[PDB]
Structure formats: structure tokens, C-alpha cells
Amino acid sequence: ALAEEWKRRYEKEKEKVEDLEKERDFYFGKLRNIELICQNDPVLQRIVDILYATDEGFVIP
Amino acid sequence: KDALAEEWKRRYEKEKEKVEDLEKERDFYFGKLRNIELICQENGENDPVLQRIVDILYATDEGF
């Protein structure tokens, strides 16, 4: 019965992985689309800098 | 038979490691979209290119 409990937790975690990678690819696809649109204007350069920022933002507006 | 529960346990640990990395990558990409959205809102200057980027931001995936 311990097999039963751990197989259930593995399948719960695997479903969370699949939902996260679907949401990640959804956002990543838009970012690739926007880079193609940008591919010189200072506003578009700021957008390109956002695409290639090495860390998540934190600044309060 | 005894190693069966240990194998399911190990596969659960591998999936839990993927979650923590996927959440950071998800927040990383979503944060970029929020920043691009903010730049488009602040810019206004009747630019068709920025309007195309806004339409990409809010386009829906008929599959999601």
C-alpha cells in the first residue's frame, strides 16, 4: 500500500509539471513572437532589453 | 516487490525538482510580458508596431 501512496504523489507532481510547462511555453512563445516583431527605436530597444534581462524584475512602479 | 515503493518515491522526487525550476522560469517569462505591457501602456505615440506587440500580449491560445 505504500506503492499506492507514492505512485499517487508522483502522478500529482507530474500533472503539476505538465501544467507548468504548458504555461511556460505559452509565455515563451509570445516572447519569441515579440522578438521577431522587433527584429532602431528607443522604445523597441527597451523591449529588447526586457527580453534579454538576466533576472526577474523587482522595481515598484 | 519491496523496491517498488522506493522507485515510485524516487520518481516523485524527480518531478518535484522540476516544479521548482518551472515555477521560476514561468515567473521569469511572465514578468517580462508584464514589463513589455507597461512600456506599451506608457508609450500614446500612435505606433503601429507597439499595437502589434499589444495584440500579441493579449492573444488567446485556442488550445490552452
- Cβ-Cβ contacts under 8 Å, A2 against chain B: 5
A20 and B11 in contact by Cβ < 8 A? Answer: no
Q: Return the C-alpha torsion angle B25, B15, B61, B43, nearest 10.
A: -10
Count how many domains chain A has.
1
Note down the domain range covering B56. Answer: 1-64
Q: What is the CATH number of the domain that holds A3?
A: 1.20.5.1430
Chain A with chain B: Cβ pairs closer than 8 A = 91
Contact yes or no for A54/B31 (Cβ under 8 A): no
Distance (Å, rounded) from C-alpha B15 to C-alpha B19? 6
